[PDB]
Amino acid sequence: MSGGTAATTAGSKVTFKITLTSDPKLPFKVLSVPESTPFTAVLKFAAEEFKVPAATSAIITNDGVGVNPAQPAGNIFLKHGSELRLIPRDRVGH
Numbered sequence: 001m002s003g004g005t006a007a008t009t010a011g012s013k014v015t016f017k018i019t020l021t022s023d024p025k026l027p028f029k030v031l032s033v034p035e036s037t038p039f040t041a042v043l044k045f046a047a048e049e050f051k052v053p054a055a056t057s058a059i060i061t062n063d064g065v066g067v068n069p070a071q072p073a074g075n076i077f078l079k080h081g082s083e084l085r086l087i088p089r090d091r092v093g094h
Helices: 039-050 073-079
Strands: 013-020 029-034 057-060 083-088
Touching (some): 013 039, 013 073, 029 039, 039 057
Parallel strands (some): 013 083
Antiparallel strands (some): 057 083
């Protein structure tokens, strides 16, 4: 079949993998978007699956880096890649 891809593939795009590190559950989230899409939209789609507010939530990495929704998807994948995690901000700015 032509045009029957279960995963969204447009051509030049970066894949993101976010899991819940603060909660006991670890529902992985796959976000396939182009470098044009900023991390603000990426964190939004991830927070949508986690059932949490993206405005008051930050994205850390599997190593231990609190990445913020400001850089573009291309820069986020270039810096870390697909190792990401969702964490709710408790104080002003995490």
